[PDB]
Amino acid sequence: QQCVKLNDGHFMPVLGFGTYAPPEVPRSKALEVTKLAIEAGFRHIDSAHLYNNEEQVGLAIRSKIADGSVKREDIFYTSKLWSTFHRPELVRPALENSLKKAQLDYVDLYLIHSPMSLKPGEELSPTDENGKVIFDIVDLCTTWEAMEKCKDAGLAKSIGVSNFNRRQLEMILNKPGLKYKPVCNQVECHPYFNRSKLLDFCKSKDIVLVAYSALGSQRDKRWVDPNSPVLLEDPVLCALAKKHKRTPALIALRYQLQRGVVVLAKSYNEQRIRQNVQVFEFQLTAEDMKAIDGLDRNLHYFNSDSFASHPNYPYSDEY
């Protein structure tokens, strides 16, 4: 593996394990594959309240610690604050609940899952009488103040954000009396949506860009148009796969590592989980990288059109 030093002083393994799996998959699977991931060499594990799996992921971690395979400090665990808990008073309590579910003392990284606040409540997707998801108006800077408090209280070693654009990031960065800068910004990032501009900006403020859907997403027919191009079927990626004798997924992952992006990779398949750790075994040439750079088509796999009306919709800006 390898690590990147956060503007926190803390370290984040550049390769992370994505734990989300559709509700159709047995929750016992999350437990089994997280163990497989750790056994394969994954040290960074990505979860969230929304995934309904923190109990299982924490179970796997606890199990591998008892195994003697790893120590708590060897694992980098991240969870995320769901959008229905943006009001400052619901932040610590939300974190405490995640910690309780995972049976952990602290989270290595806690993130604001998305800038699009939703009506407060236990329900993850609040909708009105007309079936429309209910938005909420919250000063994200106050949400951030509550996050900084969680870090001071030792519940989260590092704090960051997710799905934020440059303007939203700047809101935090320019907040009067700011104590902690977000350590990262976890966003959708892959060759068909490489986020070069955002990447350059984050790099300029020492903020780490963490890539999700780096392998082209899980293409859930619920939020992903089946007509969208299949990333792992890209001719250039496959050509580079056949050239380096690797796989399109490894090419996509290596692309991010070489451009300074921390990459997440979800897989509930034993062989693929183990294959993904091989991303550290090869290297792409400067020319290889330029070729992948030319693949961008501003394609966002998640169908976010329904929230396009949200005042905090991140895709309103060029980046």
Ligand SMILES: NC(=O)c1ccc[n+]([C@@H]2O[C@H](COP(=O)([O-])OP(=O)(O)OC[C@H]3O[C@@H](n4cnc5c(N)ncnc54)[C@H](OP(=O)(O)O)[C@@H]3O)[C@@H](O)[C@H]2O)c1
């Ligand atoms: N903060 C956010 O808003 C946000 C949003 C989305 C996701 N995330 C996080 O980032 C993670 C990754 O994103 P994602 O869920 O879209 O998944 P992804 O990593 O883009 O998914 C890659 C898909 O390709 C397959 N795959 C994995 N390794 C492969 C390999 N070596 N060769 C061929 N196919 C391979 C997997 O299927 P198999 O399981 O069959 O291997 C997986 O479904 C999530 O699990 C989650 O932790 C965060």
Ligand SMILES: CCCCC[C@H](O)/C=C/[C@H]1C(=O)C[C@H](O)[C@@H]1C/C=C\CCCC(=O)O
């Ligand atoms: C415009 C881009 C911002 C979208 C950010 C958003 O957090 C994305 C979340 C996705 C994950 O992390 C995995 C998970 O399946 C989830 C899928 C998408 C929407 C669930 C909305 C329903 C609810 O309310 O629960």
